[PDB]
Design a binder for these strands. Structure first.
Lengths: 275, 50, 266, 257, 217, 50, 48
DNA sequence: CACCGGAGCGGATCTCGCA
DNA sequence: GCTGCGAGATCCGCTCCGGTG
DNA sequence: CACCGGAGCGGATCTCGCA
DNA sequence: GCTGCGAGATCCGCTCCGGTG
């Protein structure tokens, strides 16, 4: 532990990873990793390997991107939760044409939110106003990050493959595109052999708001909750409603965190209802 | 749904019946650990019961 | 609360102790804001605790008298002589039962003593040797000596031991002396000490921060790494940082950042 | 981090404080701190208690606090009553105790000493210490102070300086749990008792005030006087004497007296 | 407390800016050269130097509704309400104050040389000399109210413990459904003080209509 | 900062009577209100005391 | 009735009929744009 | 009758290359 | 205040059925 | 005395980007 | 008759030690 200054000097001179230094001078690897963190050259030359994710979100939250196939502009519209897709060819990527396509889209379906990249048509102020005009949240992804729209990119690849497989069988490129839409919307099935269109229909049936509104008549009970650390709980903090009661646990909301949280039934006491 | 796993959202993990529906989150039963957890609506994929 | 306190300071220019007592921000943060603000520094340096030492001779008895600037807490003790070792013993007792931050003293032999200064650094508290120049300090310390002399002359007959009489005068001047809303020097000394300690507790415990280098992408070409800056809001996949060049909130994908420990040099 | 490790080594050689204490004081890993301690072969409400002790043929007056564990020590030539009166007057002046525990020593049983404590207003109790909780702490402090004096005598020129440094180490830097030194608990207790004093003093007010009611926006005549029992934001609570039930009246319609 | 009404008035071709406190009746006045917004802003600066107001009321006067005046007074940090005089509660007090101040100026202008001195003497008479009840002047009442609104009382209120309870509303003797639970603002005899969750208004309810919730055991 | 010297002196008076303070936040105007509050209670009985 | 902008109440408007009554607020018609508006009871002066 | 692949069923796992 | 995924192809783990000693 | 993280040790696992 | 791999960074599984009921 007394050789730590010499280890730091060697790190400054040569800049090897902490594992070798730990195995050599017998210093805990936490100290060596902190040395690497507090150094300069290794800090400047280390790489940020992170996993991140994708915005699957919920029902009716879609994103889109353009298609460059055979020097023809095509719009492909992709669902995230169920997996449905839809596409149509357009002469250009102009704002007015994009607005017309979006209006037809919103006539056909009932979306809620839309994601997109920094494309001029997507970013256009009139398009943003129209999206606001129909009460739909429009968020722009960070520029030069196709992984945000990786879903539409994957669907793009699959649709191009299906066009390659299906184009010579029909007279019209639009007809072939419709056939590929059928292939990837009704025929493309996996797992339980259920179409993305069927998933979307079932999602709409569940999302029907009449049942959700009328479920309010169910009995509501109150309770306290506490947090467990090393098996040692805290105080019974705050009265909150029993959102649902399960076997061995319930569902509660913490106003401090403003998010949903689960507590085992052992740390829960039931409040009797009015009588 | 997906959990944190090694880091960030992980890969999809099994089918399990939804216990209750809320706003922005639902509750599922973990098959591996047999504990109830809260999962945000951003990482759920609703499926018909069969 | 800290940015709003900074706005209040650059608008009205009160004292750091004030800004602390209203906005609840750390006292160190308030003092840093005061130092950064040019208005408060152009025209008028003592922290929470600052001490001044002026020896006195009452009834041909050498007494080491301690006075504090801001709160005004005082300490006295009779000393046999003006020897540096005796002042070292008295000062180390003073440090035993006090927690000073800074100290000022006259050109006395003990104050100038090399071994005394080495022991003062041994304890690790700032010290200055020279003629006091601050009118606040001068008026306060002269008033303190005059009041101490009056209290000694007023209280010595009733107590047998001279040390006991000095002790009773210290009682009267520290705990029994009281004014305003019931504020005594020892009360406010305890009080400012407790804000200090809770501030270090909060700063040590509550805050968990990271710094990072960042870059920008133009035409697909990564830019040169600049900064570093402070991660104001950490999130999964992306981070929110302030660009020093533009003073604007920005969002950068995690593939273009490197995580750095905050303290760096500090 | 590394900038503080050799420094911490150095003051550990100076003072011989506790591993976790220096850990929390300097942000240095506790494993390193305990290795330092093991390597150092040198180391290896306002209620007060007193027990005389002898060290190097020198009687030392020791004050032991029951709750915080704060201690005060000073060299005394003997156990004589007048000498203990002098040190106890200095003690009462320089601290603010509330109650004291003591044994049946002559300097404690002395009538003049007891009269002095009564004049100063402190409660003096004489008797054999029976509480195991008090006795274990007392013996721990005695053993620790003798050990630390043995540690610190060679470096310090003065025996009184050795006691002063020992008191510094035992009450200022030596910390446990959340790093709260017994001096810190003492200060916290004193500030808390001041807090309760001021809070109760503002509690016994229970003042009285006027009030009036509002009807369809038209004014009602002033009523009262009634006690000021609770005051919320924008309104307070007053008693309606006619109906024997309480009212809530806005601040603009309440005349306090 | 700290609620004030502003109304322009003219006496002997001299504009007097009168400030009336609705609760304690405390009054301040000063000779005003003109009803200009800048002069009113200067007068409000002087009055904020004098006092520590928290709320203010006035009519639809141009100086009061001026955007610069509104910005300056919100920089001071006070809420503003303007409109046609509608509330008898404060209008009767305002009219009585105007009549009394006119009478006192008429009484005291001969004895004093300067009109400013005369109005200062009238302010003295109305604020300090005039007393009511046990001999409490409006300025005494205002000072006591200012003393009673300091932080250490709500500090004790925070220190105090609070309980939970149910409540129901009775119409024509018919009890309603038990509602809440809400905080018990302050416990009393036969009744307690609560707040309606819908109308957000402080409500008192009898203890017979109160279901006290036991605390955790 | 202020347009008028009268406004400047008014602000200085405000800040000396309120903003500048000491101890537990005891400004000169606050302690003046305090000793007036103490004086009034005894002055009520000073009518008989005189 | 009067409207509140960024928390600041506007000048009183009317007189107008009460359209639809609710809990703690009333519905009134805007005389300018000819649209119904919801106004809290604290921002409404009932005319008897 | 135990034992191991055989076949069927289901799931686990690999690179790649789309923008 | 934000965010890589899924068609496609062999191999294998496996479970009733088989040959198989 | 059982129990769970705490810390240390060791291993498991992710993208990426080099030609 | 030939051929993607490994530095680097967090997380986690875990085991003696710890607080902990």
């Amino acid at each position: 532990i007394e050789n730590i200054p010499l280890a730091e000097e060697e790190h400054n001179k040569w800049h090897q990873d902490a594992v070798s230094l730990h195995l050599e001078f017998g210093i805990p690897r936490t100290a060596a990793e902190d040395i690497v963190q507090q150094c300069d050259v290794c800090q400047e030359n280390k790489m940020p390997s992170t996993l991140r994710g994708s915005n699957k979100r919920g029902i009716d939250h879609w994103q889109v991107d353009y298609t460059h196939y055979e020097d023809k502009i095509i719009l492909v519209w992709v669902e995230t939760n169920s997996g449905l897709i839809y596409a149509e060819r357009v002469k250009g990527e102009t704002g007015q044409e994009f607005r017309v396509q979006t209006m037809k889209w919103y006539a056909m379906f009932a979306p809620k939110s839309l994601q997109s990249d920094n494309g001029p048509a997507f970013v256009a102020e009139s398009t943003q106003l129209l999206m606001k005009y129909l009460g739909i949240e429009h968020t722009t992804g960070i520029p030069w990050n196709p992984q945000s729209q990786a879903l539409v990119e994957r669907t793009h690849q699959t649709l191009k493959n299906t066009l390659e497989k299906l184009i010579p069988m029909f007279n019209a490129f639009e007809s072939a595109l419709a056939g590929t839409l059928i292939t990837l919307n009704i025929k493309r099935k996996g797992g339980l052999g259920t179409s993305p269109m069927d998933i979307f229909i079932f999602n709409k049936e569940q999302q029907r708001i009449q049942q959700q509104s009328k479920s309010k008549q169910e009995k509501i009970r109150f309770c306290y909750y506490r947090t467990r650390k090393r098996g040692h709980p805290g105080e019974w903090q705050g009265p909150t409603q029993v959102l649902w009661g399960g076997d061995g646990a319930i569902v509660v909301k913490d106003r401090g965190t403003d998010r949903y949280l689960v507590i085992a039934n052992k740390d829960v006491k039931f409040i009797p209802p009015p009588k």
